[PDB]
Design a protein around this ligand. Structure first.
Ligand SMILES: C[C@@H]1CC[C@@]2(OC1)O[C@H]1C[C@H]3[C@@H]4CC=C5C[C@@H](OCCC(CO[C@H]6O[C@H](CO)[C@@H](O[C@H]7O[C@H](CO)[C@@H](O)[C@H](O)[C@H]7O)[C@H](O)[C@H]6O)CO[C@H]6O[C@H](CO)[C@@H](O[C@H]7O[C@H](CO)[C@@H](O)[C@H](O)[C@H]7O)[C@H](O)[C@H]6O)CC[C@]5(C)[C@H]4CC[C@]3(C)[C@H]1[C@@H]2C
Ligand SMILES: COC1=C(OC)C(=O)C(C/C=C(\C)CC/C=C(\C)CC/C=C(\C)CC/C=C(/C)CC/C=C(\C)CC/C=C(\C)CC/C=C(\C)CC/C=C(/C)CCC=C(C)C)=C(C)C1=O
Ligand SMILES: CCCCCCCCCCCCCCCCCC(=O)O[C@@H](COC(=O)CCCCCCCCCCCCCCC)COP(=O)(O)OCC[N+](C)(C)C
Ligand SMILES: CCCCCCCCCCCCCCCCCC(=O)O[C@@H](COC(=O)CCCCCCCCCCCCCCC)COP(=O)(O)OC[C@H](O)CO
Ligand SMILES: CCCCCCCCCCCCCCCCCC(=O)O[C@@H](COC(=O)CCCCCCCCCCCCCCC)COP(=O)(O)OC[C@H](O)CO
Ligand SMILES: CCCCCCCCCCCCCCCCCCCC(=O)O[C@H](COC(=O)CCCCCCCCCCCCCC)COP(=O)(O)OCCN
Ligand SMILES: CCCCCCCCCCCCCCCCCCCC(=O)O[C@H](COC(=O)CCCCCCCCCCCCCC)COP(=O)(O)OCCN
Ligand SMILES: CCCCCCCCCCCCCCCCCCCC(=O)O[C@H](COC(=O)CCCCCCCCCCCCCC)COP(=O)(O)OCCN
Ligand SMILES: CCCCCCCCCCCCCCCCCCCC(=O)O[C@H](COC(=O)CCCCCCCCCCCCCC)COP(=O)(O)OCCN
Ligand SMILES: CCCCCCCCCCCCCCCCCC(=O)OC[C@H](COP(=O)(O)O)OC(=O)CCCCCCCCCCCCCCCCC
Ligand SMILES: CCCCCCCCCCCCCCCCCC(=O)OC[C@H](COP(=O)(O)O)OC(=O)CCCCCCCCCCCCCCCCC
Ligand SMILES: COC1=C(OC)C(=O)C(C/C=C(\C)CC/C=C(\C)CC/C=C(/C)CC/C=C(\C)CCC=C(C)C)=C(C)C1=O
Lengths: 56, 43, 174, 94, 324, 100, 488, 101
């Protein structure tokens, strides 16, 4: 747990803004329109937590 | 710098560019040349 | 007599449209109905409409129906039902429509009973209208694009809606 | 006049008879692909375009500039639709 | 009207003979390009080969597989064959040499062309074979796709002529053959004719070696022969249409008394023969497209160019007041 | 008698469309086909009247109605396709969830 | 030549802007460089702008819309009535669009084609209002209908949305065929399709014994199509299913604009034409049936959308009473009812769309709303009481006229039906108020606050509903003006 | 094509030109016409910019909004100028310029 908290608390202003925008963009989805467009939106790695902290 | 973007479009889509030129001539003639020919006839 | 033949063919083919168990067969009979309709149009002297009914109804619309119905591979269990129990409801609805609607023109357009006399000699010929006869095609084209052009353009808008809707509802880009 | 259509009917009857003779003499001795629907729709649209072209083509001498530009507007609407289809990938079979 | 059946037979029977010998001519020309001899054993110079093949076909037992579409399976080749035959009722071979002088003949030809797709579709579906069905669907899609360009080219000619009467279309070329000013349109028309008749380089049904089964693979004996005959009659018809619309039909090359000596039917025949030779030559020269490539060509190349030619011809003729 | 015979032809086509609606409660594709039959009958009504009345208005509207019929069939078959895609079946018991 | 087209400047502009937005959306939605951005909100804002510019062009050019009227006569007819009807239609479209942005971004409905189809349907309804011939009327109706069919099925993976679309297309196509048959019968009987010609032929005879059965049944079939369009009983059952199954912004748009357009059509066809007492009796019986069925079915509903659908059916019954009585005050009251019902429906659907952010579905989902959002519960209560017709709220006008016509045309069964159905309606409207204010449920649903657009629209419509009867003169004068302009 | 500009409701102001030519109407643009034109275009560009930020296409969105605004504003200015020349709108300036040239 300490790793993810340390990583978040040490981020600079610019990275905080970048991740705010990324979080807003990927908060919801329209997979049907993506399938119409023939694209697959992937969650950026800076929003994915490591597996060792996930409930499973 | 839109003078080689048109070059690139012509190089990559010759059929579309040719269609646009042919149809554009077909539209330009009645829109521009025909009123000119009508005006020269009045005088 | 000839209109009796064509109407009989249309009646049977239409019953086959609405009663064939296999939907592919229904589409094929529908095509027979449009052929008979085209024959009637030729009898009326409207050769442009006679040909256009083949080009559009059979050549484009029925082809669309056939492509869709064939790829559906409908099983009869999904659409089967006995129709013997509908004979009464069709009898009343059909008869009321029959009694009212096959005879609606009779009071306004009373038929001329064919007599045992040659009325053909009373046909008056005006040669003035025959010097330069117009085809059905050119009579229609004299009007579509100038005096009634707005309706023409609205029809174009309708077709644009069809294109957009077809894409938005079914497209799955690879 | 519709007189010229009668030979066509007799021709059809004879061609049918030839077909039956030729075919009958030897008796003596679940994967729905949407792209087909889409190509059907496009064909329907341009079929109607040709349909509307026919009277216009024979009537150009009488409708003059007004008819020409009205048909041009018709074509502009339909071609915007075509551009929409092109961009969306309806014309790609890969 | 009592003599009308004689005229109809005088059209249909020589046409069937001409198809039988078009098959032989294709084989001969293909062979000669390939430095071999085509059929030259069955009859002198192989001239009896078509009769032998037809006799073999009629003497072949029919199969009629145990499908649930017994009627449709046999009627599909009848439909395509009859449609191939009936287009010739309006084709003029010379001035006054035509069975039906239709005022709406151009649209009638378009309608027949649009009807041609049903034989292939029904043969594919009724045969109870997924490969035949898929091949038939692809072939039908290709034909409807190229029909659009064919119709637009027809409209270009119609704008030039001002009448749907085929004989009038021919006689409107007395001043100049339409193939000279509209040469790219003629090239487009010939390619679209190749694609519309499922001919090389567009012959998907012939691509069995490419894992693409044709729509007629389950057919034997005379149903298969009917499909083949309809296809080759349609090739002759497309050559005739190219001749009528762009090479001035029965007209001579030059309006001179020396050329006017030879009858117009001979001029028409010679032009048709040139186009049939080009059919064979093209089949001999090139490999074939994939289905997706030819569909892309149909919708992305020939449709826009045909529409552009419609606009350009109409605009030019309206501008200088050269309309018919 | 010509005009009554031409009108009853179109009339039988219209009644057949109505009957096709009535007789096809489990088959909504045929219901769409019956609606086209009715539209064809109306189109024929306009053409016959145009000749009988010696007037062109019936013919202009007939062409435009053909355009409407084409667009209608295109959109309807798209909706049929997507309904089938969602359910995997065209049976009427799988399109009855909206009620009350 | 160019100046002739001043009569169609509004329509030219909106069509061209719609084309521009279509091209913009398709070019940038497919852009890899821009990572396929959703453009529903961008195109929505640009289309709201386009609608407002169209409204400016139309309102500021009132005389110019009548220019070259002889040249345009066989295509359409623009006058004061069409002027005000089109202005109201554009205002309704602008409001409906403004209510859609939270739906676009939070659901992530990214399809910009939704906005384009709405704009094209608005074009169709504009042409519907000015239609002066059966052919033009049919074409405009069909354009509008096809756009609705497509947008009703916009959630193309949803069972509900696909079901709505399928039912709509089948029943819509059937009704359109019936109407077209009626048009063909009228043409065959009279040789005419222009409304002026029909007025001249049909006036002075109605049913003078030798009545054209062709004319009588053409009118009947056309009326059947019209009644389907206004969701009048017994041609109504498409409406509740379509309203519930469609995406809620679609439901809001369908609830208002088509009614305005089709009622303009009905006025100019029937009122301006002539078969007469038969057709007013048609609308009389359909009004009574619609009031009764709407009241009872709405009383049965447990879901908000279905309740509003049945409420709208009942209210079109109330409105058609005005058409039935066949007087200048009848037409004026019909117009007043349409305007007030439209504003109330806009208010109600703004609330519904605000609550859809937390997926409101059942009436019981409103429990404890007076605690979790007091001003929202009050606003919704004002809408309900206005729907019930409680004075001095704006909704009281329709009730007052219903009874005014019942004692003016001389109809006491109608008055009895109005009393009973009004009481039933009040019950099922105040049931919602009881749910928000009186109930104490064990589990509460906390709703996300609405966006600025819906709050502003709600604030203005709520002042109108509460305060309209303090200053009702402009609506009364404009509706009297329109009623008169139909014949002069 | 037969044409007839005649309106249903007659002009309430002096008719300087019954059917003014396109270029005459454009040359008749006043300062108020240009103000209307510029305001409509500027508002449209602003809406394009602001609505384009979230998708990330604010520039192209500005261009699209500007095209819509240019067309709408020109149509509005033309409407006003032509209506003034035709006598449908108050046209004191047009009458004054007409009584002198
Ligand atoms: C490309 C693909 C392939 C497929 C396809 O396309 C697509 O291929 C296409 C190919 C199409 C066929 C093409 C061609 C036809 C022939 C047509 O059939 C002609 C019928 C018409 C013409 O018939 C006569 O017309 C003239 C007489 O009228 C004759 O002229 C004489 O008489 C002149 C006057 O004295 C003299 O001056 C002349 O010198 C003298 O010669 C002329 O010879 C003769 O032809 C209409 O006739 C009738 O109409 C009459 C009126 O109703 C009826 O009258 C009756 O009712 C009256 C009360 O009402 C009573 O008073 C009457 O007593 C009482 O009799 C009666 O039934 C009957 O006459 C029927 C349609 C069909 C099969 C098409 C079907 C569809 C296709 C297969 C298409 C298909 C889809
Ligand atoms: C390899 O590609 C080829 C084929 O496809 C496989 C062919 O079918 C064929 C041959 C197909 C034919 C010869 C069909 C010809 C048919 C005709 C000329 C019309 C009928 C001719 C006959 C002799 C049948 C006579 C029938 C009767 C009832 C006798 C009375 C008359 C060839 C030559 C070929 O090269
Ligand atoms: C007489 C009419 C007929 C009968 C119908 C009656 C309908 C109402 C039923 C009456 C029973 C009791 C109703 C109780 C409602 C009173 C409480 C109330 O509405 O208070 C609102 C107040 O609601 C309003 O906002 C009402 C505003 C309406 C404005 C109307 C006035 C127009 C001119 C005033 C100008 C501005 C103020 C001037 C002085 C500063 C507070 O809302 P909350 O959700 O609690 O919190 C709001 C959030 N915040 C406080 C942080 C801002
Ligand atoms: C794929 C090709 C796309 C082409 C797109 C570009 C062209 C689209 C059409 C744009 C409208 C016309 C633009 C051309 C300007 C030149 C017009 C012109 O030259 O004026 C002529 C007149 O041209 C016109 O007035 C025709 C305008 C065409 C109608 C375009 C529709 C505009 C809005 C219509 C409103 C109706 C509602 C629309 C419904 C959807 C003069 O003719 P005349 O008065 O001397 O005699 C008439 C004629 O010769 C005899 O019949
Ligand atoms: C009247 C309409 C005028 C033009 C409307 C512009 C169309 C696009 C603006 C929509 C509002 C918007 O852009 O929202 C964004 C941001 O919202 C805005 O900042 C407003 C954008 C411009 C609107 C107002 C600016 C001046 C407009 C004056 C008229 C022009 C996203 O909000 P957020 O995710 O950053 O929220 C986080 C924050 O906690 C919110 O509380
Ligand atoms: C919805 C809520 C509506 C908004 C409520 C407040 C609106 C008030 C704003 C207008 C005030 C300023 C008006 C300025 C003005 O008089 O210029 C006229 C603008 O007309 C106008 O602005 C007319 C506005 C009309 C509003 C909509 C009326 C709808 C009527 C209800 C019918 C509904 C049933 C339809 C089936 C054009 O000049 P002009 O005066 O010469 O123009 C008539 C020629 N004859
Ligand atoms: C308990 C009391 C029940 C009394 C019912 C008596 C009905 C007679 C009504 C009547 O007198 O006929 C006219 C209206 O009838 C009608 O309007 C027909 C009855 C109502 C029509 C629609 C009913 C449908 C109800 C909806 C639910 C049914 C579900 C069925 C599946 C009224 O005379 P007038 O006002 O025309 O006088 C014209 C002067 N100007
Ligand atoms: C008649 C009874 C009495 C009525 C009294 C009327 C009094 C006049 C009204 C006074 C208004 C007071 C508030 C003025 C300041 C607010 C300015 C809005 C600023 C703004 O840019 O809002 C934008 C949104 O657009 C919007 O939110 C505005 C659009 C909202 C809909 C407004 C109507 C538009 C369509 C017309 C419908 C007509 C219906 C008639 C049937 C962005 O907002 P943001 O920055 O907070 O970010 C939102 C997250 N995306
Ligand atoms: C179609 C159009 C539909 C519009 C419906 C009417 C507008 C919406 C009404 C609801 C909000 C307004 C409530 C009325 C305000 C209450 C006081 C009424 C009043 O007497 O004040 C007069 C009207 O002010 C006002 O003008 C009222 C505020 C503006 C609204 C000003 O008095 P005045 O002397 O200036 O006007 C000549 C009057 N004697
Ligand atoms: C959907 C329909 C699609 C087709 C598009 C219809 C509208 C675009 C028309 C563009 C040509 C207009 C034209 O040349 O007229 C001037 C032009 C003047 O020529 P100039 O004196 O050389 O400027 O007017 C004419 O004399 C020809 C009249 C053509 C009929 C116009 C119909 C459309 C009117 C709506 C125009 C809206 C504002 C745009 C005006 C400025 C354009 C530069
Ligand atoms: C109206 C008659 C015909 C109707 C149908 C056809 C209409 C024409 C097609 C319209 C479709 C939309 C075109 C959008 C073009 C965007 C170009 C682009 O990529 O811009 C980015 C490009 C470069 O900027 P970047 O996006 O920052 O790289 O241009 C701009 O952003 C320029 C921004 C300044 C413009 C302000 C002034 C605008 C006034 C109106 C013009
Ligand atoms: C509870 O018991 C039961 C019934 O009884 C209510 C039933 O019915 C049925 C089944 C039979 C039915 C529903 C037939 C009724 C259908 C009709 C009348 C078709 C018309 C449709 C509607 C929605 C009625 C609307 C029409 C009205 C109100 C009047 C028409 C118009 C005017 C007067 C202008 C069953 C099984 C049943 O168990």
């Amino acid at each position: 747990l300490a790793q993810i908290h340390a990583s978040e608390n040490s981020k600079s202003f610019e990275q905080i803004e970048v991740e705010r925008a990324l979080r807003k963009k990927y908060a919801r989805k329209d997979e049907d329109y993506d399938s119409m467009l023939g694209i697959t939106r992937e969650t950026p790695p800076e929003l994915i937590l490591p597996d060792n902290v996930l409930p499973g | 710098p839109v003078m080689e973007k048109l070059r690139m479009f012509v190089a990559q889509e010759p059929v579309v560019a040719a269609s646009c030129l042919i149809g554009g001539v077909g539209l330009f003639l009645p829109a521009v040349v025909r009123p000119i020919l009508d005006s020269l006839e009045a005088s | 007599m000839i209109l009796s033949v064509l109407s009989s063919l249309a009646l049977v083919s239409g019953l086959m449209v609405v009663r064939a168990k296999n939907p592919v067969h229904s589409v094929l009979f529908f095509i027979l109905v449009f052929c008979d309709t085209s024959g009637l149009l030729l009898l009326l002297g409207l050769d442009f409409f006679a040909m256009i009914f083949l080009v559009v109804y059979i050549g484009a619309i029925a082809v669309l129906f056939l492509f869709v119905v064939m790829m559906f591979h409908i099983q009869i269990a999904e659409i089967h039902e006995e129709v013997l129990r509908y004979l009464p409801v069709s009898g009343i609805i059909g008869l009321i429509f029959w009694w009212e609607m096959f005879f609606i023109l009779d009071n306004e357009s009373i038929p001329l009973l064919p007599t045992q006399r040659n009325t053909t000699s009373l046909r008056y010929t005006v040669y003035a209208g025959k010097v330069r006869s117009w085809t059905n095609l050119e009579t229609l084209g004299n009007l579509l694009y100038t005096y009634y052009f707005v309706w023409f353009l609205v029809s174009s808008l309708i077709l644009l809606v069809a294109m957009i809707g077809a894409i938005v509802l079914t497209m799955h880009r690879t | 006049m519709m007189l010229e259509f009668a030979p066509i009917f007799i021709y059809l009857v004879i061609s049918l008879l030839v077909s039956l003779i030729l075919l009958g003499v030897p008796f003596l001795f679940s994967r729905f692909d949407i792209r087909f629907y889409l190509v059907s729709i496009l064909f329907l649209i341009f079929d109607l375009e040709v349909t509307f072209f026919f009277p216009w083509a024979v009537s150009l001498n009488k409708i003059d500039l007004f008819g020409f530009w009205s048909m041009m507007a018709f074509l502009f609407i339909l071609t915007i639709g075509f551009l929409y289809e092109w961009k969306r990938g309806a014309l790609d079979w890969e | 009207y009592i003599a009308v059946p004689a005229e109809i037979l005088g059209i249909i029977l020589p046409l069937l003979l001409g198809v039988a010998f078009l098959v032989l001519a294709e084989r001969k020309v293909m062979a000669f390009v390939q430095r071999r001899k085509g059929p030259d054993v069955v009859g002198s110079f192989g001239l009896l080969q078509p009769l032998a093949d037809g006799l073999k076909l009629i003497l072949k037992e029919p199969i009629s597989p145990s499908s649930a579409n017994f009627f449709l399976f046999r009627m599909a080749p009848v439909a395509t064959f009859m449609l191939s035959l009936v287009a010739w009722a309006v084709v003029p071979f010379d001035y006054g040499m035509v069975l039906s002088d239709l005022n709406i003949g151009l649209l009638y030809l378009f309608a027949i062309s649009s009807l041609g797709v049903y034989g292939i579709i029904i043969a594919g579906r009724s045969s109870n074979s997924k490969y035949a069905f898929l091949g038939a669907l692809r072939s039908a899609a290709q034909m409807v796709s190229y029909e659009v360009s064919i119709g637009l080219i027809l409209i270009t000619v119609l704008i030039c002529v001002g009448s749907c009467n085929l004989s009038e279309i021919v006689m409107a070329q007395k001043q100049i053959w339409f193939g000279i000013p509209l040469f790219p349109v003629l090239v487009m028309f010939f390619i679209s004719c190749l694609a519309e008749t499922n001919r090389a380089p567009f012959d998907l049904p012939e691509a069995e070696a490419e894992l693409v089964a044709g729509y007629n693979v389950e057919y034997s004996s005379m149903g298969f022969a009917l499909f083949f005959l309809g296809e080759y009659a349609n090739m002759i018809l497309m050559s005739g249409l190219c001749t009528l619309f762009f090479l001035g039909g029965w007209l001579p090359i030059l309006d001179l008394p020396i050329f006017k000596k030879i009858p117009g039917s001979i001029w028409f025949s010679i032009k048709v023969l040139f186009f049939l030779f080009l059919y064979i030559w093209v089949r001999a020269a090139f490999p074939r497209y994939r289905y997706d490539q030819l569909m892309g060509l149909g919708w992305k190349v020939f449709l826009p160019l045909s529409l552009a030619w419609v606009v350009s011809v109409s605009g030019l003729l309206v501008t200088f007041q050269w309309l018919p | 008698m010509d005009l009554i015979k031409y009108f009853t032809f179109s009339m039988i086509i219209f009644i057949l469309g109505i009957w096709g609606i009535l007789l096809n409660r489990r088959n909504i594709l045929i219901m769409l086909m019956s609606i086209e039959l009715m539209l064809l009958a109306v189109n024929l009504n306009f053409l016959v009247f145009s000749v009988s009345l010696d007037d062109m208005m019936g013919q202009v509207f007939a062409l435009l109605v053909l355009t409407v019929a084409a667009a209608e069939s295109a959109i309807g078959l798209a909706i049929f396709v997507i309904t089938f895609r969602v359910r995997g079946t065209i049976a009427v018991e799988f399109i009855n969830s909206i009620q009350g | 030549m160019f100046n002739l087209f001043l009569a169609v400047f509004p329509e030219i502009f909106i069509i061209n802007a719609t084309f521009i937005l279509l091209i913009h959306g398709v070019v940038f939605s497919t852009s890899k460089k821009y990572d396929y951005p959703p453009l529903a909100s961008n195109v929505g804002w640009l289309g709201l702008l386009s609608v407002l510019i169209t409204l400016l062009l139309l309102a500021a050019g009132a005389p110019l819309l009548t220019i070259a009227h002889l040249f345009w006569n066989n295509l359409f007819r623009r006058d004061n009535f069409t002027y005000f009807c089109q202005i109201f239609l554009l205002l309704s479209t602008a409001g409906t669009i403004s209510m859609c942005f939270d739906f676009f971004d939070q659901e992530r409905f990214d399809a910009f084609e939704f906005i384009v189809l709405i704009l094209l349907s608005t074009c169709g309804m504009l042409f519907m209002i000015s239609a002066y011939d059966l052919i033009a009327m049919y074409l405009a109706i069909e354009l509008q209908s096809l756009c609705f069919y497509v947008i009703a099925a916009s959630k193309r993976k949803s069972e509900f949305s696909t079901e709505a679309g399928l039912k709509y297309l089948i029943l819509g196509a059937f009704s359109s065929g019936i109407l077209l048959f009626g048009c063909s019968m009228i043409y065959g009987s009279t040789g005419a399709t222009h409304f002026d010609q029909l007025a001249k032929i049909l006036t002075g005879y109605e049913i003078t014994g030798a009545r054209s059965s062709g004319i009588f049944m053409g009118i009947l079939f056309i009326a059947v199509g019209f009644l389907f369009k206004i969701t009048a009983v017994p041609f109504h059952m498409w409406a509740p299913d379509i309203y519930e199954g469609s995406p809620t912004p679609v439901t809001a748009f369908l609830s208002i604009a088509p009614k305005i357009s089709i009622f303009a059509n009905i006025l100019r066809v029937f009122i301006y034409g002539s078969y007469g007492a038969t057709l007013q009796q048609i609308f009389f019986f359909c009004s009574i049936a619609s009031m009764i069925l709407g009241a009872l079915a709405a009383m049965a509903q447990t879901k908000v959308k279905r309740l509003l659908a049945y409420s709208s059916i009942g209210h079109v019954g109330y409105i058609c009473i005005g058409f039935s009585c066949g007087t200048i005050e009848g037409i004026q009251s019909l117009l007043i009812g349409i305007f007030i019902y439209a504003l109330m429906t806009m208010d109600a659907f703004a609330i519904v769309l605000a609550l859809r952010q937390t997926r409101v579905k059942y009436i019981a989902d409103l429990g404890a709303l007076a605690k979790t959002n007091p001003i929202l519960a009050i606003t919704f209560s004002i809408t309900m009481f206005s729907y019930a017709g409680i004075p001095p709220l704006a909704g009281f006008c329709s009730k007052f006229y219903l009874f005014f016509a019942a004692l003016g045309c001389g109809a006491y069964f109608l008055a009895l039906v109005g009393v009973v159905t009004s009481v039933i309606g009040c019950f099922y409207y105040i049931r919602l108020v009881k749910r928000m204010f009186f109930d104490t449920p064990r589990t509460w649903i906390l709703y996300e606050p609405m966006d600025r657009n819906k709050s502003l629209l709600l604030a203005m419509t709520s002042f109108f509903i509460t305060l309209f009867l303090l200053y009702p003169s402009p609506l009364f004068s404009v509706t009297h003006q329109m009623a008169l302009s139909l014949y002069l | 094509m037969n044409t007839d500009i005649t309106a249903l409701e007659k002009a309430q102001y002096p008719v300087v030109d019954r059917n003014p030519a396109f270029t005459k109407v454009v040359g008749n643009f006043s300062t108020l016409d240009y103000l209307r034109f510029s305001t409509i275009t500027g508002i449209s560009v602003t809406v394009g910019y602001l609505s384009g930020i979230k998708p990330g296409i604010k520039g192209p969105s500005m261009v699209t909004g500007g095209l819509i605004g240019l067309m709408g504003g020109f149509m509005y200015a033309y409407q006003n100028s032509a209506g003034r020349l035709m006598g449908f709108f108050p046209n004191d300036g047009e009458v004054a310029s007409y009584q002198k040239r």
